[PDB]
Each structure stands twice: as structure tokens, then as C-alpha cells.
């Protein structure tokens, strides 16, 4: 419908997309949300779902780039300057939509997101957004936009980091999800295995230390994090 | 990749 | 030109991009006038237009899903919503069916020139035309499915004549064929006598099969069965 | 969906 307007109705049709797996519109249709409720805050539903919604977008071409990225690598060590020249396009084309996805949300988040955010939840949990997409252009960059994309990371992950420990509880799922993406930050970005485990297990024993105060609501989300973050140490580990 | 970041 | 796409066509499916993969093949077919597609490019083609209709027609289904029960609840202005959206993806649905019917009808049956390869275009061509009569209603639905028996008779003519009853094109036939009796044209026994006569016949031969084309066969053949199986109870 | 199709 030409007049569908508000964050109600868009809503329902971001959540329809995602029902089709159709992420792409989900995009779209979080975006008008956005839109509409310019100035004021997103509820938790919408914030979601919003998030949902680019991790599916991004995370569709970040497997691509993946797979793209080995084969031209391994055709390179073939010697196969033909292949290698066609392979080389096709990841630039995957790395202008990475670019264009990551640019989209980080736009949202740098001029009505992050602004409005008025409780700790909120700050923690767009500044981890934040961090997220400038992560996932370290991921591809190179030169100095790579390093531009890497200190924008570190910077959104650390003034997260400074508010969740003065805010959150040591169990809650967003501080928990920071820490496991600042130690892969570490780990994958920065080559810094040890920091990465450092961190990794601090935010594991700070939880466990106070198990008893996550209760019966975020409970189920923080273990799974909680276990991420276990897993990760043991493979960084071995 | 190795590693595991948030859901 | 044809090699250079092929390779595309082959990265695309690699990363699952497969609209993109369709546009390589589309291209390749164009390069290639009069003569055959090779298998390779063949598979690369069926590939891409089965992943890029096969993701439509999973949304499609939830969506007509999500309609009924938005309906039952008497949400109204929900079940516009949907409808404007399902939509969406039937046009979708019917201009990916119309590119590969077109290309089918002006390039790949013509060229056609082996049984091997007569059958597998028909059946393609019923296969895309059942896909319209999934969700097609009134003339275009009837169409379709005038379209689909049509395409897949002649298919069989063919494959029963000049591919053994063992041929996983012959046998993919058949199983289409069914499937298209049992959902679309709600004849369950016939449905269930072609998938049964299909698997008789192919169990008949089935020792002459070597290691590499017996994978292959009883692959199909077990889909006959498991549809069988579930056809056979209701 | 009962009935698979050919792959
Ligand atoms: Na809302
Ligand atoms: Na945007
Ligand atoms: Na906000």
C-alpha cells in the first residue's frame, strides 16, 4: 500500500519478510521504521528486528566473500591469471555490496540510533552494533581504510565496553555479546590471540562469579553467549 | 572461520 | 565468451548467488547458437533456476500460510498487507518461470538432438509451467497445467522409447509426472500407478547398473518410493 | 510439502 505508514505497519512487514527469508526487503521495510520514529527511541522488538535484518543481509555476502576469497587464493597458487582476473571482479562486486550494507546501518546508527539512546541497554547495544559493521569491514578492507575501520571498531567497542561495566550486569546478554565480539575482534582483526582469550575469559568468570543474578528471562540468552565464549577459548586454545 | 560472534 | 561464463556461472553457484548464476547461463545459452548446451552447462543451468524459483516458491508457501491465519483471525487490514505482498512474489515466481520457458521453447528444444536431451528440456519445460499452476488461479492456472501434461507426454513418449527405464532423466520424469498428477491435478491413483510402473520398470534392469550410475538411479528411485509410501496411506 | 520432486 502507497499510504502504509508508522512503525506499526511496517512492522508487519518486516516481520513478513522474514518469514519469507526475504532479508533484503526486511531491510527495507526496518528502515522505514526508522524513519518514522526519527527523534524518539526503537522499542526492543524493533531494535531486533532491525538487527535481525542486516545480520541476514550482510551475513549472506560475508560467506560469499569467504568462499570467493579461498577459490581466488587457490587459483592464484595455480597460476591461473585468467581465473584469478574474474574471481578478482566478482569479490569487488561482493565488497561493494558489504560496503553498501555495512554503510546503511552504520548511517542509521551514527544519526538517529545512537543519539537517542537514553538508558544503558540501548547505548551498549548500538555501540556494539556499531563496532559489529566497522568489524565486518575490517573483514574485506585493505590499507588505510582497513586500519580507518579497525580503529572505528576498537573505539565503538571500548566506549561500549566502559558503559556496560558501569551499567550491566555482568550476566546480561548485551554485555556478555559484547565481550564475545570484542575478543573476536581481537582475535580475527588484530592477530592478538592472547588478548582475545584474556577478554574472552574475564567476561566468562565476571558471569560466572554472579550466576545467580541472571534470572529465568535472559537466562537462556547469556549461556548461549556464555558457552560462545567457552568454545572460543578452547579453540583458541588448541 | 574458528570463531563464534554474538547471535 | 562460453567458457568465460561458465566459470562465472560456476563462481555464483559457489557463493550461492544464484540469480546472478541464472544471468551467467542465460548468457552462455546465447553464446552457444544451434548447438547443444554440454551436460556441464546443462546441470549449471537447471541448478540456478531451480535454486532461484525453489527459494520464491518456499516464501510463497509461508506467506499463503501467514494470509489464512491472519484471515481466520479477522485482521483484515493484515491480510491486505500479505495480499499485496504475496503478489509480489507470484510476479517474481512468473517472470523467472517465463525466462527459462522462453529460452526452453526458442533455443534448448529445438537444438535439442539426442532423446538424452529431448526429455530432459520437456521435462523442464512441464516442470516450469507446474510451477505456475502452483499458484496460478482461473485461465492462466488451467493453462499451465495444460502446458505441464502436455510437455510431459511428450517427454515420456520419448524417454519410454529410447532411455532405459534405469535413465535418472527418465526416472525424474516419471517422478515429476507424479508429483504433477498428485498436487496439481488431484488424481492420486494415477499419481500412484505412474510413480509405481516408473520403479517397477527401473527395478527390473537394476543389475546392469555399474557404481557411478547406480548412485545416480536408485537415488530418484527412492524418492519414488518415499512418495509411494505417503501417497499409498492418503 | 508430502511429495519431493526430482532434484
Ligand atoms: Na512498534
Ligand atoms: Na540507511
Ligand atoms: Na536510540
Redesign the pocket.
Known amino acids: 500500500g502507497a499510504m502504509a505508514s508508522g512503525?506499526?505497519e511496517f512492522?508487519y512487514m518486516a516481520k513478513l519478510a522474514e518469514q519469507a527469508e526475504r532479508y533484503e526487503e526486511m531491510v527495507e521495510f526496518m528502515e522505514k521504521?526508522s524513519a518514522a520514529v526519527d527523534g524518539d527511541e526503537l522499542?526492543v522488538?524493533?531494535r531486533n528486528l532491525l538487527s535481525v535484518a542486516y545480520k541476514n543481509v550482510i551475513g549472506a555476502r560475508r560467506a560469499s566473500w569467504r568462499i570467493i576469497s579461498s577459490i581466488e587464493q587457490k587459483e592464484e597458487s595455480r597460476g591461473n591469471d585468467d581465473h584469478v582476473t574474474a574471481i578478482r571482479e566478482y569479490r569487488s562486486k561482493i565488497e561493494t555490496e558489504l560496503s553498501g550494507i555495512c554503510d546503511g546501518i552504520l548511517k542509521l546508527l551514527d544519526s538517529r540510533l545512537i543519539p537517542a539512546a537514553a538508558s544503558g541497554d540501548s547505548k551498549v547495544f548500538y555501540l556494539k552494533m556499531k563496532g559489529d559493521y566497522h568489524r565486518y569491514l575490517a573483514e574485506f578492507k585493505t590499507g588505510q581504510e582497513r586500519k580507518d575501520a579497525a580503529e572505528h571498531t576498537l573505539a565503538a567497542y571500548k566506549s561500549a565496553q566502559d558503559i556496560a561495566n558501569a551499567e550491566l550486569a555482568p550476566t546480561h546478554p548485551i554485555r556478555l555479546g559484547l565481550a564475545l565480539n570484542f575478543s573476536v575482534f581481537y582475535y580475527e582483526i588484530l592477530n592478538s590471540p592472547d588478548r582475545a582469550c584474556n577478554l574472552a575469559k574475564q567476561a566468562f568468570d565476571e558471569a560466572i562469579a554472579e550466576l545467580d543474578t541472571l534470572g529465568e528471562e535472559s537466562y537462556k540468552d547469556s549461556t548461549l553467549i556464555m558457552q560462545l565464549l567457552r568454545d572460543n577459548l578452547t579453540l583458541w586454545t588448541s | 572461520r574458528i570463531s563464534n560472534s554474538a547471535p
Do not use: G, I, K, Q
Open positions: 512503525r506499526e512492522v521504521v522499542t522488538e524493533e
